[PDB]
Symmetry: D2
Subunit: 223 residues, 4 copies
Amino acid sequence: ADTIVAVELDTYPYPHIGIDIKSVRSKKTAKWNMQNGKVGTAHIIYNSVDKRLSAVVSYPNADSATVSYDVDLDNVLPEWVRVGLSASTGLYKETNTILSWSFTSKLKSNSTHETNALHFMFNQFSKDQKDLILQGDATTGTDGNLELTRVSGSSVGRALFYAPVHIWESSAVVASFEATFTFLIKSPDSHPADGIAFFISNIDSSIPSGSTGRLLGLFPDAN
Amino acid sequence: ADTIVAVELDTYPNSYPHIGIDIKSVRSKKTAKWNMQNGKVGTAHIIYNSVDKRLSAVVSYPNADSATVSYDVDLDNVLPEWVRVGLSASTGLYKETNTILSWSFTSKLKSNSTHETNALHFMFNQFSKDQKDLILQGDATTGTDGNLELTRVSSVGRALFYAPVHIWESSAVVASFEATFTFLIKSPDSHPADGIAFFISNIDSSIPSGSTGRLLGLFPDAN
Amino acid sequence: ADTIVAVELDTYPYPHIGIDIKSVRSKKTAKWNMQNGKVGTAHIIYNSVDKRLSAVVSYPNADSATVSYDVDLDNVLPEWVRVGLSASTGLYKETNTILSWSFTSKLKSNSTHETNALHFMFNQFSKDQKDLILQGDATTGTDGNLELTRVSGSSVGRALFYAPVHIWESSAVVASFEATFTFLIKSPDSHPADGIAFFISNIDSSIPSGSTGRLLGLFPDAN
Amino acid sequence: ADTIVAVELDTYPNSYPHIGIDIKSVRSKKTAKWNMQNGKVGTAHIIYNSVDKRLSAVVSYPNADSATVSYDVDLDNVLPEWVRVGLSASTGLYKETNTILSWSFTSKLKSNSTHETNALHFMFNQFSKDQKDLILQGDATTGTDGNLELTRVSSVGRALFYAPVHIWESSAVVASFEATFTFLIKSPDSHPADGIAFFISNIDSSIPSGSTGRLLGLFPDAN
Ligand SMILES: [Zn+2]
Ligand SMILES: [Zn+2]
Ligand SMILES: [Zn+2]
Ligand SMILES: [Zn+2]
């Protein structure tokens, strides 16, 4: 199937932030205080020296939650990947609006003035966002935002950046990436089941069949 | 026909070697004398912004005089909203190369809104054998020393960045881009005919039939 | 006295955006529709190839105003300078709040991989902002903002970045800078006299005596 | 005494040449074997972030093995909120230089707020004779080839960036910095005693009396 590494924020049947390395059974999780209707901000960072994937989710007035996991991505992910955002809603009326998304990847060689870098920043999505590959119920343009799930009952959507990303190289001394997105989960329900995730996958990843709910449109089954 | 805007460096004795600005036609809209240095690494800096609406280029060599050409033009009226940017090169009948040692690009769309900037930035200082984020056309190849050989080493080649680029938007207060690339044109011949160009085209641009020589793999005819 | 180059927004006795090269008698001006109580955004840009200083002031819902002026800063300003913000209030109750300020300067040499760059971004000012030199009634910390004039009748204040800036060099092929600040001018009065300015000066510039009102704390007299 | 945090590269046979992390004391908190290469340009990459709270360093040479050392430490508890960053070097009694070919630094403070990042970034690829944005101490000088000679060419020298740096803030969700510098240690001697260090100190730090040799111009005594 696909190779997935993802930082997920879910409230399915307890809300927690977690790190998934190829399985929905989070390798590490942290208690998350999901704030309905408030804009949240996830910061994800990783570097080949530390070989540690770290995440921080904070809200204004701020209850930050953070989870880290030691892992050498060189052994998990393919050399070239595509990065993206995912979301799945349970049986509840709710949205998973992405207000902004920015990413930065760098490969520094042994070679002096070594650097290879890719950087994108979306602070406003357009109706025709040709540099985003939308999958599922994901769409753009709504207020300049990115609606991962359909806005108005079991919906899944994803948005991946068009250009493949050279996330690692055997001849780099330090490889590193950093992602940041601001989201808005609004539900009229008091305890909605929902999930958003920043994921890294093989370039041609697609929504597995049956990847709804707890599977975040990332995994085909709970193994 | 494709829509092309390109800054070209050519020595085809149509008639000194010159740097020139092409807006949809090979008969440069503006040109400047260029002192092509065989075997030395050169550096082209291209910059544009919607406020000034002036496309400018500077080509210098170490210990060098620089050559510069600017041209007033509102790209909003020439290019489509979404484009792809790339490098091109055509060799006449001479033994010579068109090695690109580095290429970096940055695009920015700043809206009327407070804190609404959209940006794309890539930097290649070392090209790998499998550069999956570059669309190679013609005789173009990568990996040779970590360089990009646009031409065969009567050759024509191009390399376009994979991700489409949002160059303009009707709602931006200042749209801008800036490109930089270092090249090496080596030829055993004393007066070789050659040509490199940084170009901006429609996303699905391809090498027109018979765009060899003085047509730089960009134009199908001068006529 | 001091050497001043500044992009000013004034409504003194008609509101206009203007470019001042060593004198308060703007070298070029544009009609400005001052919006009381609304956050505005000034973008200032300049590059040595074009040798043109350009400014854009827009508000949300947007009425943008823009003014450009052809000038080779190499002949006006000293090699090393300090950049800053200034404001002066007439006899009115009003504020000149700076919500954010960011600047970027680059010096690219003939030399391959030439770059020298300085970049700062303030999106939140602290009560002890040790990297800012405050002059006059200027203070920080108020909401995380920068109050150029005193907040509650003839007040002048300035804030300059601590580190001197190498704005030009004789051996650079392209020198360029770019500044952006968001301001809030709130006055209970319908037609208040006020002025804010982004200025470049000699490193040890200070508020001239009698630089109030129309003189923006930049000039000592109207010559 | 000054508060010093520094990543040091030393060959003083106190006992192989090593790279080490110093937190307020010259007796390194952590060290790694370093294979000092006489006459070859080296590259030190230093990185830290408040989420991981781990200070890491990588020193590589071309065609090289890299040496790396990391140390868990919350800088919030060691350093003052505002600091100055710099480079240091001390030579033993040998003929040798400590030329810094380039130095770049980036600091970021991201708040709980949506879109509230504060950043400082400098890049020196060429030092001029009058580098007004650098505070030189000891035998340090600039302009020599466009390089920075920390030591006399029993010498000690330092260079600190002029602007104080806000390294931490109690209200930031992720504070981070990253430094990179390329050096050249040439010595006619086969086993020279030498030392370079990237350090972070209180804004008004100065070379302690007798901080020569194995004290790297950073510490007044080991004892
Ligand atoms: Zn889970
Ligand atoms: Zn031509
Ligand atoms: Zn005026
Ligand atoms: Zn030691």
